[PDB]
Amino acid sequence: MAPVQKQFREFHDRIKLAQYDENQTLRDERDAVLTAVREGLKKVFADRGEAAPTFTPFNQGSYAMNTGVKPLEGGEYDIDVGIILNIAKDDHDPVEVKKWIRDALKDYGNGAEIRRSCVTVFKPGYHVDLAVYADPELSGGTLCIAKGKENSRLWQISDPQGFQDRIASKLSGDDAAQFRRCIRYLKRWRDFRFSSDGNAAPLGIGLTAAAYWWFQVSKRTDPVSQNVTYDDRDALEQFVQTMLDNFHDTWDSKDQRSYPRLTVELPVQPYNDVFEKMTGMQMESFKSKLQALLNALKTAKSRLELHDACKALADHFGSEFPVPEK
Numbered sequence: 001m002a003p004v005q006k007q008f009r010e011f012h013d014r015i016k017l018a019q020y021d022e023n024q025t026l027r028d029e030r031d032a033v034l035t036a037v038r039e040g041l042k043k044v045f046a047d048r049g050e051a052a053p054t055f056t057p058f059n060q061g062s063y064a065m066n067t068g069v070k071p072l073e074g075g076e077y078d079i080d081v082g083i084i085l086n087i088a089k090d091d092h093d094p095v096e097v098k099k100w101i102r103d104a105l106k107d108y109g110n111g112a113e114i115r116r117s118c119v120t121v122f123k124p125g126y127h128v129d130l131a132v133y134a135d136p137e138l139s140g141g142t143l144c145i146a147k148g149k150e151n152s153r154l155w156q157i158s159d160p161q162g163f164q165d166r167i168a169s170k171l172s173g174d175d176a177a178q179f180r181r182c183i184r185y186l187k188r189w190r191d192f193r194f195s196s197d198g199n200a201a202p203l204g205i206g207l208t209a210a211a212y213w214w215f216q217v218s219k220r221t222d223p224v225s226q227n228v229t230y231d232d233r234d235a236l237e238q239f240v241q242t243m244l245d246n247f248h249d250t251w252d253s254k255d256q257r258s259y260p261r262l263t264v265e266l267p268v269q270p271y272n273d274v275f276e277k278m279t280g281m282q283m284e285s286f287k288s289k290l291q292a293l294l295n296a297l298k299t300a301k302s303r304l305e306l307h308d309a310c311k312a313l314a315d316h317f318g319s320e321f322p323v324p325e326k
């Protein structure tokens with residue numbers, strides 16, 4: 001077994017949150033918000049004199065892709081769900097359609113909100129993000145998400161299920177398990193080391209897309225038993241180094257200097273840079289913490305004391321990373 005592998009797997013056990021298909025609590029919180037939208041929609045449509053449109057829900061985000069992590073103590077997790085309304089996109093305003101959902105949920109938990117890319121509804125210790133789509137069958141065969149706020153506002157080409165397929169299909173079996181563990185490791189690193197300023201934090205979807213582009217399996221196959229052991233520390237080292245290698249100095253005419261920028265395109269429509277909202281200064285801070293994480297992964301390979309190897313990693317991963325006594 002690889003150095004620190006046992007402690008990586010124990011860390012993984014502590015940070016993992018079970019996917020929808022394995023998690024009754026998340027399925028119930030999801031389904032309660034879905035019910036709340038159906039009932040809520042009757043109310044909104046009683047003023048327009050016809051049946052509210054029906055919707056088809058589907059799982060999205062980390063609990064659909066089995067890349068979910070528990071929040072830090074007193075943080076919130078996000079349940080992500082898509083609803084495809086039985087509407088033609090050209091017949092309705094995206095913000096109008098997101099308004100229906102917001103007003104449907106106005107009086108659910110601590111209220112609803114219209115975001116650039118979703119309607120978010122707040123409850124204790126978690127929020128639910130409802131991506132709102134028009135019917136492809138009614139909208140010229142494309143799946144379009146409702147983008148923009150009151151203060152702003154389009155139907156944008158979207159492919160959440162294609163993204164989810166890409167993440168599921170990149171690898172299989174125990175190879176795909178290491179891939180998923182390494183996404184979760186970086187999500188906990190993100191939560192632990194970007195807690196000062198949430199806006200500066202690399203989005204979960206960006207770490208997932210980065211893994212899609214750049215993650216490589218690390219495993220060794222015994223010359224005798226042919227028995228296979230995974231090396232998460234080495235997989236993470238190679239993955240982090242590859243991300244660092246893809247930062248590019250980018251000139252900023254206002255500040256008259258360069259900032260290092262990591263561009264991570266979604267591998268499906270709309271193929272946008274998921275990190276495009278991060279400022280140059282937030283990118284410089286992201287790069288420096290990634291470099292510090294890389295340095296710790298290399299130190300952890302070289303320590304004679306397992307205590308010192310694990311301590312070096314706990315400095316970047318936080319309180320759930322096991323540190324054996326010296």
Ligand SMILES: O=c1ccn([C@@H]2O[C@H](COP(=O)(O)NP(=O)(O)OP(=O)(O)O)[C@@H](O)[C@H]2O)c(=O)[nH]1
Binds near residue numbers: 078130
């Ligand atoms: O397909 C999609 C796309 C987007 N989303 C949801 O959209 C959210 C992305 O976050 P956001 O873009 O909706 N937030 P925003 O209002 O732009 O913040 P800011 O302008 O800085 O003040 C995420 O929480 C996703 O879960 C989906 O759920 N599904």
Ligand SMILES: O=c1ccn([C@@H]2O[C@H](COP(=O)(O)NP(=O)(O)OP(=O)(O)O)[C@@H](O)[C@H]2O)c(=O)[nH]1
Binds near residue numbers: 059069161187
């Ligand atoms: O830019 C994009 C593109 C796509 N999506 C879509 O939104 C869904 C996930 O929504 P999300 O933004 O919450 N991503 P997630 O993986 O849950 O990060 P995290 O909560 O930190 O673990 C996915 O099914 C994507 O297809 C976005 O949210 N943003």
